[PDB]
């Protein structure tokens, strides 16, 4: 008959899904689909933790479609070839999907749409992962924002969209239709091992739409009230842990905003009100970087600002390796890198500390770090990750005066009792918090823990010297 295909990519859920809801209003014969794209899966920048989470979200999505009335088709190969072929073999009335903000996804999408148009099949691309699309937030001159302040002021004033309906009572494909597409389908969802990956480090929130919705609700029911200032301490479990759920769409952005907004209205405490407004602004910050990547795709290439594209990075491989292996000798840094490689997630305050360290202290092209994070983060996200690293050098959007973190100051300020440090560096649980914070540990009391790979003071003078020299040379 006239079935509609909904192509899932980073919206692995059936609830509050813009493109999916629009598709259901056009037809009950709604068949979901996911394509295992080799250019994504085989990339050297793919994190095992991310594939594990992804695979887990898909397992649940297969069930949701089954329960809804149809199914989730699985494909493996090139999208602009396989999607059009599948839609054609199925004489699809249309193929729906939610828009991407990333260069690769957008280029791929334009190609799939063109292939569909050629085949005479409708392609509908709608915005779903953002409360406000990049085209809705523009300045008085109709231009994008590269400074957060003005962006937030506009974004905040825009009326917020509400969650859309979950599609129900779907019509499954028939045997004859299934025969027509048989050659293009995988018989079953490959396991993590079959795909060639292994992960046993756990997750910030268990995989799947259900677990994501439960976490959102548990967070907004309590912990969110203390977000500010509990968000600043790595030792405290004061954040939501929903990052991978938002990256893969296990949770809808409108459900998240609504749950927080409802918690704000329910709250009668001023401090709780503030804490919730602060969390909400985190979501605004997320959109700033996503819109930035959309408007200025070259950001993905590396240092944006002209001065930084010329910065003389030292790039001592040995220093980088030590960083990736948590053998820097700086407790607060090694504890964080251990949390990342071991659990696939890192507290935001720690991401800032280790990024600054790699760029300011080790003086390594931050792209090596951006890539290492992408190779390990369960929430590895180009817009946010690139935004985070451009930040470590003010080389991109919303630049700030040159500054260099002192691991010791940060450690003392956000892990004053060294609880987080001892937690991830148990072999140093005997050392005094004072020494773990300052980074000055006596050889005997240090055991196998390495000594500082660099002298902060000297590295700091070196970085500024290179900055001022290039600053003048221009
Ligand atoms: C160097 C560096 C790299 C980063 N890499 C990523 C990454 O690859 N993927 C990722 O999603 N975030 C990244 N962040 C942002 C951030 O650290 C995380 O979103 C956070 O640790 C997620 O924990 P949470 O879900 O408990 O956050 P919460 O505090 O509960 O915040 C809620 C949501 O807001 C968003 N968010 C919060 N902080 C920011 C921010 N700084 N920029 C963009 N979005 C934000 C996330 O979607 C997050 O889940 C990076 C920041 C830095 C400094």
Choose which residue among 236, 254, 379 to substitute to test ligand 1 binding: the one with the highest number of ligand atoms within 8 A of its C-beta. Answer: 379
In 3-state terms the chain splits into helix, strand, coil percentages (rounded to 5) of: 55, 5, 40
User: CA 344 to CA 290: how far, in whole Å?
Assistant: 22
Dig out the tokens for 321 from the structure: 């390796």
Beta bridge partners, 95, equal 5, 123
Q: Which helix (H) or strand (E) holds 205?
A: none
* 441 domain residue, yes or no: yes
Q: 């092209």: which residue's tokens?
A: 365
Three-class secondary structure of residue 97 per DSSP: strand
Say if residue 20 is in the same domain as residue 38. yes
* 170 domain residue, yes or no: no
Sheet with 30-36, strands from edge to edge, namely: 72-76, 30-36, 4-8, 94-98, 122-126
> What CATH number is attached to the domain comprising 13?
3.40.50.620
- Which atom, in ligand 1's list, is nearest to the CA of 345? 21
User: CA 195 to CA 102: how far, in whole Å?
Assistant: 24
Residues present in the chain in total = 474
The verdict on the CB of residue 379 being under 6 Å from ligand 1 is yes
What are the distances in angstroms from CA 15 to CA 12, 25, 254, 355, 389? 9, 14, 10, 36, 33
* 431 domain residue, yes or no: yes
Ligand 1 centroid – CA 129 distance (Å): 15
The DSSP code for 119 is T
Is residue 327 a contact partner of residue 453, using CB atoms and an 8 Å limit? yes
Q: Whose CA is nearest to atom 48 of ligand 1?
A: 243
Say if residue 271 is in the same domain as residue 363. no
* 315 domain residue, yes or no: yes
Structure determination technique employed = X-ray
Three-class secondary structure of residue 135 per DSSP: coil
The DSSP code for 222 is T
The DSSP code for 269 is -
Say if residue 334 is in the same domain as residue 263. no
* Domains held by the chain: number: 3
What are the distances in angstroms from CA 20 to CA 91, 119, 177, 252, 416? 19, 22, 21, 12, 47
- Report the sign of the C-alpha dihedral through residues 20, 23, 24, 30, in that order: negative
| Buried b / exposed e along 285-318 (16+ C-beta atoms within 10 A) | bbbbbbbbbbbeeebbebbbeeebeebebeeeee
* 184 domain residue, yes or no: no
User: CA 58 to CA 158: how far, in whole Å?
Assistant: 33
* 242 domain residue, yes or no: yes
User: CA 31 to CA 171: how far, in whole Å?
Assistant: 8
At 278, phi and psi to the nearest 5? Answer: -70, -40
Say if residue 9 is in the same domain as residue 85. yes
User: CA 38 to CA 330: how far, in whole Å?
Assistant: 38
Dig out the tokens for 175 from the structure: 């045997």
Ligand 1 centroid – CA 326 distance (Å): 21
- C-beta neighbour count of 37 within 10 angstroms: 20
What are the distances in angstroms from CA 216 to CA 57, 241, 349, 401? 16, 9, 21, 36
Report residue 427 CA to chain centroid gap.
31
> What CATH number is attached to the domain comprising 319?
1.10.579.10
Q: 């360290």: which residue's tokens?
A: 357
Dig out the tokens for 450 from the structure: 């390495």
Dig out the tokens for 257 from the structure: 């905003």
- C-beta neighbour count of 394 within 10 angstroms: 18
DSSP-derived pairing of the beta strands 72-76 and 94-98: unpaired
Question: Residues with Cβ < 8 Å from 243, sequence gap 6 or more?
Answer: 204, 345, 378, 379, 381
Say if residue 29 is in the same domain as residue 87. yes
User: CA 148 to CA 289: how far, in whole Å?
Assistant: 9
User: CA 450 to CA 226: how far, in whole Å?
Assistant: 37
At 404, phi and psi to the nearest 5? Answer: -135, 125
The residue out of 268, 296, 324 marking a domain boundary is: 296
Say if residue 244 is in the same domain as residue 321. no
> What CATH number is attached to the domain comprising 263?
1.25.40.80
Beta bridge partners, 94, equal 4, 122
Ligand 1 centroid – CA 151 distance (Å): 18
Three-class secondary structure of residue 4 per DSSP: strand
What angle is formed at CA 416 by the lines to CA 413 and CA 422, rounded to 5 degrees?
125
Rg (CA), the chain: 24
What is the 3-state secondary structure of 143-194? CCCCCHHHHHHHHHHCCCCCCCCCCCCCCCCCHHHHHHHHHHCCCCCCCCCC
Could you give the dihedral angle defined by the CA atoms of residues 73, 74, 79 and 81, in that order, rounded to the nearest 10 degrees? -70
What are the distances in angstroms from CA 3 to CA 31, 122, 125, 168, 433? 7, 12, 17, 15, 63
User: CA 103 to CA 165: how far, in whole Å?
Assistant: 30
* 187 domain residue, yes or no: no
- Report the sign of the C-alpha dihedral through residues 459, 460, 464, 467, in that order: positive
At 127, phi and psi to the nearest 5? Answer: -85, 130
The residue out of 296, 314, 347 marking a domain boundary is: 296
Say if residue 444 is in the same domain as residue 310. yes
At 97, phi and psi to the nearest 5? Answer: -170, 155
* 223 closest CA partner among 287, 276, 297: 276
Ligand 1 centroid – CA 291 distance (Å): 15
Is residue 184 a contact partner of residue 85, using CB atoms and an 8 Å limit? yes
**Is there a cis peptide before residue 321, judged by omega within 30 degrees of 0?**
no
User: CA 135 to CA 23: how far, in whole Å?
Assistant: 22
- C-beta neighbour count of 432 within 10 angstroms: 12
Say if residue 137 is in the same domain as residue 124. no
Three-class secondary structure of residue 431 per DSSP: coil
Say if residue 245 is in the same domain as residue 306. no
User: CA 344 to CA 375: how far, in whole Å?
Assistant: 9
User: CA 400 to CA 440: how far, in whole Å?
Assistant: 30
What are the distances in angstroms from CA 95 to CA 18, 32, 124, 378? 14, 10, 6, 29
What are the distances in angstroms from CA 100 to CA 97, 112, 146, 402? 9, 13, 20, 33
The verdict on the CB of residue 241 being under 6 Å from ligand 1 is yes
The DSSP code for 457 is H
Say if residue 414 is in the same domain as residue 455. yes
The residue out of 261, 296, 331 marking a domain boundary is: 296
* 99 closest CA partner among 212, 166, 3, 22: 22
Say if residue 274 is in the same domain as residue 422. no
Is residue 307 a contact partner of residue 294, using CB atoms and an 8 Å limit? no
Is residue 251 a contact partner of residue 242, using CB atoms and an 8 Å limit? yes
Q: Which helix (H) or strand (E) holds 123?
A: strand 122-126
The verdict on the CB of residue 380 being under 6 Å from ligand 1 is yes
The DSSP code for 208 is S
Question: Residues with Cβ < 8 Å from 188, sequence gap 6 or more?
Answer: 74
Is residue 393 a contact partner of residue 304, using CB atoms and an 8 Å limit? no
Catalogue the active-site residues. 282, 285, 313, 348, 366, 389
* 156 domain residue, yes or no: yes
What is the residue range of 464's domain? 297-472
User: CA 186 to CA 195: how far, in whole Å?
Assistant: 13
Say if residue 268 is in the same domain as residue 360. no
Is residue 186 a contact partner of residue 36, using CB atoms and an 8 Å limit? yes
């Amino acid at each position: 008959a006239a079935p509609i295909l909904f192509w899932h990519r980073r919206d692995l859920r059936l609830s509050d899904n813009i493109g999916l809801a629009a598709a259901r209003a056009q037809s009950a014969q709604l068949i979901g689909l996911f394509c295992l794209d080799p250019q994504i899966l085989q990339s050297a920048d793919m994190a095992p933790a991310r594939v594990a989470y992804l695979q887990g979200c898909l397992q649940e999505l297969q069930q949701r479609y089954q329960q809804a009335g149809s199914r989730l088709l699985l494909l493996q190969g090139d999208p602009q070839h396989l999607i059009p072929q599948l839609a054609q073999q199925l004489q699809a009335e249309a193929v729906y999907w939610n828009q991407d903000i990333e260069p690769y996804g957008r280029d791929r999408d334009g190609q799939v749409a063109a292939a569909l148009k050629t085949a005479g099949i409708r392609a509908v691309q709608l915005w779903d992962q953002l409360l406000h699309s990049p085209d809705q937030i523009l300045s008085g001159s109709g231009n994008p924002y590269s400074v957060y302040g003005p962006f937030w002021k506009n974004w905040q004033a825009q009326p917020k969209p509400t969650p859309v309906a979950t599609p129900t009572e779907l019509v499954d494909l028939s045997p004859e239709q299934l025969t027509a597409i048989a050659p293009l389908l995988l018989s079953e969802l490959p396991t993590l091992k079959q795909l060639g990956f292994d992960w046993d480090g756990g997750f910030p929130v268990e995989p799947g739409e259900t677990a994501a919705i439960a976490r959102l609700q548990e967070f907004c029911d309590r912990a969110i009230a203390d977000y500010d200032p509990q968000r600043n301490f790595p030792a405290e479990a004061g954040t939501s842990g929903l990052s991978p759920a938002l990256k893969f769409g296990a949770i809808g952005i409108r459900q998240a905003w609504q749950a927080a907004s409802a918690a704000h209205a329910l709250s009668r405490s001023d401090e709780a009100r503030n804490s919730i407004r602060v969390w909400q602004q985190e979501l605004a910050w997320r959109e700033f970087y996503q819109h930035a990547l959309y408007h200025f795709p070259s950001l993905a290439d590396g240092p944006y600002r002209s001065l930084w594209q010329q910065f003389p990075w030292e790039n001592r491989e040995a220093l980088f390796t030590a960083w990736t292996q948590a053998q820097t000798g700086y407790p607060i840094v090694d504890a964080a890198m251990r949390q990342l490689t071991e659990t696939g997630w890192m507290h935001n305050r720690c991401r800032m500390i280790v990024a600054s360290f790699l760029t300011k202290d080790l003086i390594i092209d931050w792209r090596r770090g951006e890539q290492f994070f992408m190779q390990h983060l369960v929430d590895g996200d180009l817009a946010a990750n690139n935004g985070g690293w451009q930040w470590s050098a003010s080389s991109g959007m919303d630049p700030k005066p040159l500054r260099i973190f002192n691991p010791a100051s940060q450690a003392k300020k956000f892990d004053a009792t060294a609880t987080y440090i001892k937690r991830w560096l148990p072999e140093l649980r005997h050392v005094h918090p004072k020494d773990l914070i300052s980074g000055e540990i006596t050889p005997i009391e240090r055991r196998g823990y390495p000594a500082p790979i660099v002298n902060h003071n000297l590295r700091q003078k070196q970085f500024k010297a290179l900055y001022n020299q290039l600053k003048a040379a221009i």
